[PDB]
UniProtKB/Swiss-Prot annotation, chain B:
The gene is RPT4. N-acetylated by NAT1. This is 26S proteasome subunit RPT4. It comes from the Eukaryota. The 26S proteasome is involved in the ATP-dependent degradation of ubiquitinated proteins. The regulatory (or ATPase) complex confers ATP dependency and substrate specificity to the 26S complex. The chain holds residues 67 to 175 of 437 of the full protein. The lineage of its organism: Eukaryota, Fungi, Dikarya, Ascomycota, Saccharomycotina. Belongs to the AAA ATPase family.
UniProtKB/Swiss-Prot annotation, chain C:
The gene is RPN9. Residues 187-355 form the PCI domain. Keywords: Proteasome. Belongs to the proteasome subunit S11 family. GO terms for cellular component: cytosol; nucleus; proteasome complex; proteasome regulatory particle, lid subcomplex; proteasome storage granule. GO terms for molecular function: structural molecule activity. Present with 12400 molecules/cell in log phase SD medium. Acts as a regulatory subunit of the 26S proteasome which is involved in the ATP-dependent degradation of ubiquitinated proteins. It comes from Saccharomyces cerevisiae (strain ATCC 204508 / S288c) (Baker's yeast). InterPro entries: PCI_dom (IPR000717), PSD13_N (IPR054179), PSMD13 (IPR035298), Rpn9_C (IPR040798), WH_DNA-bd_sf (IPR036390). Transmembrane segments: none annotated. This is 26S proteasome regulatory subunit RPN9.
UniProtKB/Swiss-Prot annotation, chain E:
Present with 17200 molecules/cell in log phase SD medium. GO terms for cellular component: cytosol; nucleus; proteasome complex; proteasome regulatory particle, base subcomplex. The gene is RPN10. Disruption phenotype: Cells are viable. This is 26S proteasome regulatory subunit RPN10. Ubiquitinated, leading to its degradation. Ubiquitination is promoted by HUL5. It comes from Saccharomyces cerevisiae (strain ATCC 204508 / S288c) (Baker's yeast). Belongs to the proteasome subunit S5A family. Residues 5-190 form the VWFA domain. One of its GO terms (molecular function) is K48-linked polyubiquitin modification-dependent protein binding. GO terms for biological process: proteasome assembly; proteasome-mediated ubiquitin-dependent protein catabolic process; ubiquitin-dependent protein catabolic process. It comes from the Eukaryota.
Curated annotation (Swiss-Prot), chain F:
The chain holds residues 23 to 153 of 306 of the full protein. It comes from the Eukaryota. Zn(2+) binds at residues 87, 89, 100. A motif (JAMM motif) lies at residues 87-100. This is Ubiquitin carboxyl-terminal hydrolase RPN11. Present with 16400 molecules/cell in log phase SD medium. N-acetylated by NAT3. It comes from Saccharomyces cerevisiae (strain ATCC 204508 / S288c). Component of the lid subcomplex of the 19S proteasome regulatory particle complex (also named PA700 complex). The 26S proteasome consists of a 20S proteasome core and two 19S regulatory subunits. Interacts directly with RPN8 and STS1.
Length: 157, 109, 387, 45, 197, 131
């Protein structure tokens, strides 16, 4: 299998925009991550949210705009060119048809398998508020890679 | 009928030629995003994760290690690659004292 | 019957306005079979729910209509049935004559859409080629030359991506036919499970073909102990889809035969073909011991004490003390479990590695082992907080 | 015939949209290329 | 004169399995995009054209509202002609697309090309009809199928959805064959004419 | 009184990450937020800006890039007025900015609360972060 390493800057930055949008429990926030997925250890050095809209009574209803994703990728080339789209994250504890069907949508702009993330806003239990999940085509099942938290010398201190 | 079609077929060949230019231009910015790396040779081994590497300019520093390198080849007598910011070992390069090629190659014809 | 001679002709004319480039002999060929019950490649919309094993008279008719099949219903009828189902006809004359229609005729294209390109949906241009590459040597000339073409099938499988699982299983069907006529059926039993095991939609066959498929699954597990035992097919939709008579119960008879340990019961219900090979009796006794070898850690003993004696295994395998000493070494040498024995004190020390499919024996103990953790929460929990 | 000539001609306009993107990248390269650059010695290619 | 947003819906079903109207199929839907943009955005401002697909491959959004239909035509590339049919999913996603857009508080028009009779649920299509009336959303369904497909839940959705006059929907039947798709749509109330609010 | 910027935990690390590449290499960015003069100042979100031929300067601000980033952050609820610019200057280490001198005077015309946050000793973090 592979491994996942997410810096603490990415984890807390995803929780900030959740409250800034006044998102209640009936809604969830979806976003994308950046890093290097080529090696065996997936590293996430950046994250960006997306204007995700979902109906609470229907799991087949979601709003995902790729034009904001295409623009976001062009804006990142002027900041950090070494970063590419390795996958996408989302908020909320529940997994419904909204987040399961969009996994193939991000696959068009992502060369590797998109890494699914569940960001716990309340931080309930143990550690690791965010879990890294990967999907297989062969039957599909959500498996969790050995996600770890590591950063640079100046970022950890 | 075929007059307007042949004009677009010639433009389609120019589209694929520009597709290679799009990535080539984007890779230019990707090549400029990279930074410089200091090259030095290991002098004395202070500890497992602590090494003493002499910089090419003549000063020496105590540098760390990463998980992308093997400490077996980081011993003395092996040229390594340092960092210009945090002063740590980044990658591993083959040993070349002073790579002057015009002196090494004899230009045989 | 009259359903194909009449209604099937009308259904073909409904799609794509009327008469979707149908040759005038289409209705003329329908008057050939008539009441003789020859369906002969029902051509898409009917062919999905209707199977025909008869020799098609129209085989050379619809060959030029393959471009209209994508505009009629779907391209899946071409990659699965019709020319791709020609192998199911099983004709001695047709053998190795399909290189014109199934290779040369398909070689004229590249991605299967040339200059006609539409919205360009995926899923075409792969199965129409790689499926018939290995099928050339499955008949006539020996499979030795087919193995060189099987490696290229597995390389393109991991590189490409296919939404339907029948394409991936089709590649394993060629590997299954390779080891079917050759020894070392452990690989044949492995490739046969990956072909159809847990997947309902893929590999859709009739009831009569399920018993023939289960027959190959039965004889494959007779000659090897790998991948659990004969009880593995019990939970899988295999043993439940067959009949308990006509020598199809061999998988059920060997389930209780492991605990009873009587070879004469299963030997009387089989034929001379599989009973003339000693490998059947050797590997059957191994599965009987593998149940007892796994009793050293967690099966019966609640205290998890790891011990085994040559006297206990002697009564389980119905063998004397001299034969059980050499029999344990054979099980370890095959890569089953790791450990050694003691001849001086007559003891057998073996750990537990390979899991089984059975449940209910170890369920009570997994909770009982945590009961010992319950009494350990008090003494070290209170004394640590007091410091 | 009419549909075929309305695709590559429209795709060429979208290729011009990507052409507007590479020109924006070239302008950044024109910013990334400025006269006062130093000169070093390349020992190994 | 007319200020509204346009949403194109591409749906596929068992009756859409045909691949050829005259020489082909689904390219007429591609050709009909340039006639809708020029007759709305180029004619008057504050008129945007969106593109969504609620059936076939996956219920996704092919192209959002843009200043040109070229990106709309590019979003139609690599689109399967066969897939599952969800009518309620395509309508509810269209409401989310009309929620986030530019120049809000306007008329809402949705152009849905449907080749199927749309048989799913009777009460589900009725509850979605009352929601679209409060937002003044107009879902225009054009029938393709084989010849004309009617006397089904498709007309039941159109009959019960209209409280107002012009603000809901209109029926357009397209005969399969060598016919111009944009001509029947341009002469229809879908493009300008009725529906201004 | 004066303007003392209260920086959150995420906004502080992002400014150090943008100037993470190279000691001599210089970058820039933009600060956003809503606060009041007199004392308390907040920063909602920040993002880096591209580098022009002049490096860090007043003409290095790209209005095309700035307008697109404000639209990307508007959908995320982080859209705020422009409160100033931040810059990471090279490894000179004499006084702060090695280029910008009077550029802040031109920044006062657009916003009177505009400030320039610069980390002088590149990246040095041991027991504290000096900004």
């Amino acid at each position: 299998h592979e491994k996942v390493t997410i810096a603490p800057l990415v984890l807390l930055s995803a929780l900030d925009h959740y409250e800034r949008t006044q998102t209640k429990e009936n809604k969830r926030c979806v976003g994308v991550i950046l890093g290097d997925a080529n090696s065996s250890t997936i590293r996430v050095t950046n994250s960006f949210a997306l204007p995700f809209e979902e109906d609470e009574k229907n799991s087949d209803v979601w709003f995902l705009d790729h034009n904001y994703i295409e623009n976001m990728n062009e804006m990142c080339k002027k900041i950090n060119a070494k970063e590419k789209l390795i996958g996408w994250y989302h908020s909320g504890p529940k997994l419904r048809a909204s987040d399961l069907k969009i996994n193939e949508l991000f696959k068009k702009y992502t060369q590797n398998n998109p890494l699914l993330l569940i960001v716990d806003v309340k931080q309930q239990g143990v550690g690791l508020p965010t879990d890294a999940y990967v999907a297989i085509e062969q039957e599909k099942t959500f498996l969790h890679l050995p996600c770890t938290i590591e950063a640079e010398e100046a970022e950890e201190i | 009928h075929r007059r307007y079609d042949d004009q677009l077929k010639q433009r389609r060949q120019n589209i694929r030629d520009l597709e290679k230019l799009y990535d080539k231009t984007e890779n230019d910015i990707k090549a400029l995003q990279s930074i410089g790396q200091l090259i030095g040779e290991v002098m004395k081994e202070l500890s497992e994760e602590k090494y003493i590497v002499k910089a090419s300019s003549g000063p020496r520093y105590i540098v760390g290690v990463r998980n992308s390198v093997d400490r077996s080849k980081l011993k003395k007598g092996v040229r390594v690659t340092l960092d210009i910011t945090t002063l740590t070992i980044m990658r591993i390069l083959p040993r070349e004292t002073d790579p002057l090629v015009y002196n090494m190659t004899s230009f045989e014809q | 019957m009259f359903n194909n001679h009449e209604i099937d002709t009308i259904l073909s004319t409904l799609r794509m306005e009327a008469d979707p480039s149908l040759h005038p002999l289409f209705e003329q060929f329908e008057k050939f079979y008539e009441e003789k019950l020859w369906f002969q490649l029902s051509e898409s919309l009917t062919k999905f729910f209707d199977d025909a094993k008869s020799t098609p008279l129209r085989l050379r008719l619809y060959d030029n209509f393959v471009s209209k099949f994508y505009d009629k219903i779907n391209q899946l009828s071409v990659v699965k049935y019709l020319l791709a189902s020609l192998k199911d006809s099983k004709d001695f004359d047709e053998s190795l004559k399909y290189l014109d229609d199934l290779k040369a005729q398909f070689q004229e294209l590249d991605s299967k859409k040339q200059r006609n390109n539409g919205s360009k949906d995926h899923g075409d241009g792969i199965l129409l080629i790689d499926s018939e590459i290995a099928r050339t040597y499955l008949l006539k000339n020996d499979l030795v030359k087919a193995r060189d073409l099987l490696d290229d099938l597995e390389k393109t499988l991991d590189k490409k991506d296919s939404i339907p699982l029948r394409i991936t299983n089709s590649f394993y069907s060629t590997n299954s036919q390779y080891f079917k006529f050759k020894n070392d059926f452990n690989s044949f039993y492995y490739t046969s499970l990956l072909y159809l095991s847990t997947l309902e939609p893929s590999t859709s066959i009739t009831l009569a073909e399920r018993q023939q498929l289960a027959y190959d699954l039965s004889i494959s597990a007779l000659l090897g102990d790998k991948i659990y035992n004969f009880g593995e097919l019990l939970h899988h939709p295999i043993m439940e889809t067959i009949v308990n008579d006509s020598n199809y119960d061999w998988l059920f008879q060997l389930l209780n035969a492991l605990t009873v340990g009587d070879f004469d019961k299963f030997d009387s219900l089989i034929k001379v073909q599989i009973s003339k090979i000693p490998i059947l009796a050797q590997h059957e006794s191994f599965l009987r011991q593998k149940i007892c070898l796994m009793t050293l850690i967690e099966t019966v003993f609640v205290k998890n004490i790891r011990m085994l004696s040559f006297e206990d295994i002697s009564k389980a395998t119905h063998l004397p003390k001299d034969n059980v000493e050499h029999l344990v070494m054979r099980a370890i040498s095959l890569g089953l479990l790791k450990g050694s024995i003691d001849q001086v004190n007559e003891l057998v020390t073996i750990s537990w590695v390979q899991p089984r499919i059975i449940s209910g024996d170890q369920i009570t103990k997994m909770k009982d082992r945590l009961v010992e953790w319950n009494d350990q929460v008090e003494k070290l929990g209170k004394k640590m907080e007091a410091r | 015939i009419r549909i075929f000539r309305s695709e590559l001609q429209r795709l060429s306009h979208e290729n011009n949209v990507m052409l507007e993107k590479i020109k924006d990248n070239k302008e950044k390269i024109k910013n990334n290329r400025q006269l006062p650059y130093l000169v070093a010695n390349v020992v190994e290619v | 004169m007319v200020l509204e947003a346009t949403v194109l819906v591409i749906d596929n079903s068992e009756y859409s399995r045909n691949g050829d109207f005259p020489r082909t199929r689904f390219e007429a839907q591609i050709d009909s995009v340039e006639f809708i943009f020029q007759a709305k955005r180029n004619s008057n401002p504050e008129n945007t054209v969106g593109l969504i697909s609620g059936a076939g491959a996956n219920p996704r959004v092919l192209s959002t509202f843009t200043a040109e239909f070229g990106k709309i035509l590019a979003g139609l590339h690599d689109t399967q002609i066969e897939g599952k049919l969800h009518m309620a999913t395509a309508l509810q996603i269209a409401q989310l697309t009309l929620k986030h857009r530019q120049n809000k508080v306007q008329h809402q028009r949705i152009v849905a090309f449907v080749c199927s009779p749309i048989s799913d649920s009777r009460d589900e299509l009725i509850r979605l009809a009352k929601t679209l009336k409060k937002n003044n959303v107009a879902v225009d369904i054009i029938n393709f199928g084989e010849i004309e497909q009617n006397t089904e839940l498709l007309d039941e959705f159109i009959a019960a959805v209209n409280n107002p006059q012009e603000e809901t929907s209109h029926l357009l039947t397209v005969t399969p064959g060598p016919r111009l798709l944009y001509e029947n749509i341009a002469s229809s109330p879908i493009i300008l004419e009725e529906g201004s609010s | 009184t004066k303007e003392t910027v209260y920086i959150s935990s995420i906004a502080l690390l992002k400014m150090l990450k943008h100037g993470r590449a190279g000691v001599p290499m210089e970058v820039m960015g933009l600060m956003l937020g809503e606060f009041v003069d007199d004392y308390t100042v907040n920063v909602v979100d920040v993002f880096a800006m591209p580098q022009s031929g002049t490096g860090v300067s007043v003409e290095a601000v790209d209005d095309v890039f700035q307008a697109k980033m404000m639209d990307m952050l508007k959908q995320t609820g982080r859209d705020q007025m422009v409160v100033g610019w931040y810059h990471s200057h090279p490894g000179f280490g004499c006084w702060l900015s090695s280029v910008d001198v009077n550029t802040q005077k031109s920044f006062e015309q657009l916003n009177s609360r505009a400030v320039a946050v610069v980390v002088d000793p590149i990246q040095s973090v041991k027991g504290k972060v000096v900004i």
